[PDB]
Design a protein around this ligand. Sequence first.
Ligand SMILES: [Zn+2]
Lengths: 128, 80, 204, 99, 145, 113, 60
Amino acid sequence: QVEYRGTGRRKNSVARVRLVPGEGNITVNNRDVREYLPFESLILDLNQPFDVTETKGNYDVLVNVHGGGFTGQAQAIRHGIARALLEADPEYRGSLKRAGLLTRDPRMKERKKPGLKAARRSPQFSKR
Amino acid sequence: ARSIKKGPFVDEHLMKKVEAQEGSEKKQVIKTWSRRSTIFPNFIGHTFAVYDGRKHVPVYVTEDMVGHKLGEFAPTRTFK
Amino acid sequence: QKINPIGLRVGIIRDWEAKWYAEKDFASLLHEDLKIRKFIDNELKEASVSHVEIERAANRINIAIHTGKPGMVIGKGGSEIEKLRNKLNALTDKKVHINVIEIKKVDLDARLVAENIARQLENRASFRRVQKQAITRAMKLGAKGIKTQVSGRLGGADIARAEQYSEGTVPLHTLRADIDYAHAEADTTYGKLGVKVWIYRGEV
Amino acid sequence: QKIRIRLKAYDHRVIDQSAEKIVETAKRSGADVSGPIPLPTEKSVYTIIRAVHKYKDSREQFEQRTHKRLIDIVNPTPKTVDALMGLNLPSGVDIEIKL
Amino acid sequence: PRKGSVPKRDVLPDPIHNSKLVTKLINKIMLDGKRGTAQRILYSAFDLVEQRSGRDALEVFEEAINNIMPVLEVKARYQVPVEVRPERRTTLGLRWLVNYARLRGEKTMEDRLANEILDAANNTGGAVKKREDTHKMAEANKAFA
Amino acid sequence: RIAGVDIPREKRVVISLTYIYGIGTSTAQKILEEANVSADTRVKDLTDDELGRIREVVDGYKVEGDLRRETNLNIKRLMEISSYRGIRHRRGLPVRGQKTKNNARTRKGPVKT
Amino acid sequence: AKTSMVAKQQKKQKYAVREYTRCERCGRPHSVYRKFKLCRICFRELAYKGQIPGVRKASW
RNA sequence: AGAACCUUACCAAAUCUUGACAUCCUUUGACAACUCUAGAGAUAGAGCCUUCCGGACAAAGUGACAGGUGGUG
RNA sequence: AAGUUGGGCACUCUAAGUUGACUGCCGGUGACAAACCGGAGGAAGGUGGGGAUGACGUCAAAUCAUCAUGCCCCUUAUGAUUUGGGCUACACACGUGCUACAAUGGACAAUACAAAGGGCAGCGAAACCGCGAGGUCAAGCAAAUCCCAUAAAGUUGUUCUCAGUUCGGAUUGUAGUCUGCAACUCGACUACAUGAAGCUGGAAUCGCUAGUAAUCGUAGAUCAGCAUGCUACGGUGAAUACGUUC
Ligand SMILES: [Zn+2]
């Protein structure tokens, strides 16, 4: 077995990520990552934690991710992968932190304010 | 009502008043507030004083007026 | 411009005066409670009825009348309380059980103070002296702060204005603070006079 | 052979204390209880024009939040049923029992 | 009425080229958040310029930005001239590049961008003309410095 | 040239048929499927038998001048009966119950300030 | 609202579509919530008095 | 935070005057959904006819009185 | 076929209780102060992001039409009932918005990813009928269970090739669906045809400093029916702030 489990969050997307000794294949909701995600930039971002830890291609990733859109779920997966690598080896904490991958991006969608069109946008003003 | 599955709408009182005195050729004018009633072929040749809000406008029914409402020939607003 | 302090604090450090739950007949129960409250207010005007809590369960209506003159409401032989209960049962098909709660210090109760000052104003007392004596007695009875205000055609003057007095601390912006607020109306020969009273009896 | 108890209340404090009371009653009667399980709270928001007249851009937003609690009794007993049906809860909480 | 300067954002390098300038060009091209459309447009334009020049896409892009980056500008106050900050240079270069590319006559934005970067590299583009006009007016108003 | 009207030569047949008054996209596709013809084939690269079949299908659809005459007759009948729609047609105002206080330009012509 | 209008709203309508809701506390015809049978103004006043179970000022 | 009717406060027409709604006072009920006729309806004409406990309740008459989204923020 | 059921509470999640962030520690600038800047640690760093909360006062600002109320006024009418018509008019001027003028696009087919709400005579699954909006039968569901309800933008393929057009969808004809006693004045939507201006807008002028603007959809109150408005939700997701002369 030897499973390294972790959680990742981004916007409204939650990704349960499991790392196993493998060849670098990433499966997301029983689908290949390069098919699930609509851009290769997302795949590169997902692999970025592996590059930082210097264990690229040494793990197969199994992802159960739901919520948000594609970028949100991709970055949730990246956060989960970083957390799983932390769990596997505490020595990667410094590298991951310097890469800024352990941070759970706290940015969320601001509520809409009453009397405004949006969170900040206000109605067009007209003197006279 | 408008849906075909329901027959064309017409007030029962208006329809029965039209039917009355059908045989006699001395057909008279019928006072009506029913702007919403549809015009049936039975109405052809009749005169309806249709209330448009303040007065009963006389309307004479012809063949081309079949299928329309009695209100379409009693305008309600005045302009110029 | 100032939020009603009771409305601000309800559900935070102040409990609802209507203690019940409903899913289908919520509106019916709400308006039943409203007519009950209106009837009690109209019937116990002379009594110093500070406030009323209403709960309902098992097709029963538990009324809790917090008053400063419990003797008047109950009656010497319970006749008054029994008559009120009978009238409430006549109004509402359900069965009503009424409890009376004694208020020891009526001069620290915002609503009672507001009603007293409104009564004096209707009696044509001085809108300044009434507020001064109210604040004085409330402060001597241990209140940490009190504020009184009267607005309208004060001495019958054509131009309506408002005047208020204070003493101690009344921190209306502190959400912890248990501030008792009341508004009353005097129906003077010249019209409506609005009296407002805030009382802060301290941390509890 | 399970008994479901659904509690709904506007106050999470009162709902929690009622849930604890019923769980304690069931355990005293002898049945085994799985719970309490907090179901998602249902929040209804109401937006009102604060002013009596005009002044659309100033609003006030109220809410009513009903909290939901679920209790499962696994091994019912006549004593447990009698205790549950005789137990009295605060007027705030609404309790439904499904046998 | 302003306390001071605020922190500036830092963008990540292009995932394929590892270039902050490429990232910011993608951001400039992006409209309504369509980052994917911006990415595909930029990559197609880079491929087109690579094919049409036989030279590295990054090299030609760097030459184009260097050509279209100004050194002096003028601000109303009459118009007084002033030097341009190093980051203002890149901002203006990218903004003018994208604007005049969109103004070109080619059918597709990829063709427009490729032709515009080629013209900038050759020093005969719309962004080049804009830089020349800016420098000319700065020199004309050099006295007000 | 179908129904007495020429059509663009370089345009695909399905689109080019819409240039016939009374023929839109849906009816063009329906005609093209009834008279079997490739959807993407341009009219210039078209066969005489295909053109004849298209003409045979089209002739029965009541398009062009006959359609214009029918629409004009309907409008004239509603004008003549003195209906509300007829009055609004005569006055050049919106007929389907729009609001004329503003935004009635397509019926009232250009703004006369 | 007018007393005659409130009475007419309460009385049975020959039509069924001819039924409309009025605030049961003051009679305002507009902006009446179904759950409380109250207009926005009465709703605000009673929520401030704390006499609508479970209703409090919202924020998030 | 919902103008086809209703809403609706405006207009035309057909209609009522203790009144569409509330309390008191005299008589006392079988009131009233329901069916017929005449009316655009509101309403009027005879039936049918079904309720009710020292009295809730509900009809008819009269006088107090009602009513106003009328004015003055 | 399906987390569908047997089993489990690991994970996610749900919701109660707790811990956490305080310039706390380190180094500089600073009058050893306050504070500012940078760093470590931390998920979060400088009131972390937002909400509610609005002092003493100004404008005889708004509201007598939510409600209440002094005074004045009408009482065979300024009160009351009903049907019909106004509030929807239309030579015109202004505010706020929706849709576009296209290739960062239009059309066609295939295929993913949300959040937040509502449901009792109400949400109406599947199936059948109709090209269609919808109609018949009708399961489940008073709710973390069923439904509303497949989000769109996106991604991948074919076509159009810069053309007032395969852009744009007003306007009008005809034929229908639904609600409602009743869609003429005066509802929404659907099918066929019709296919207007408009090819990025003068003087001027508005919003917005980050998950913001911009774009894309989603839900709800009112509500028989009727939303480009309002109130909420999330997907993608920027640019710039030198400085205080104006
Ligand atoms: Zn009200």
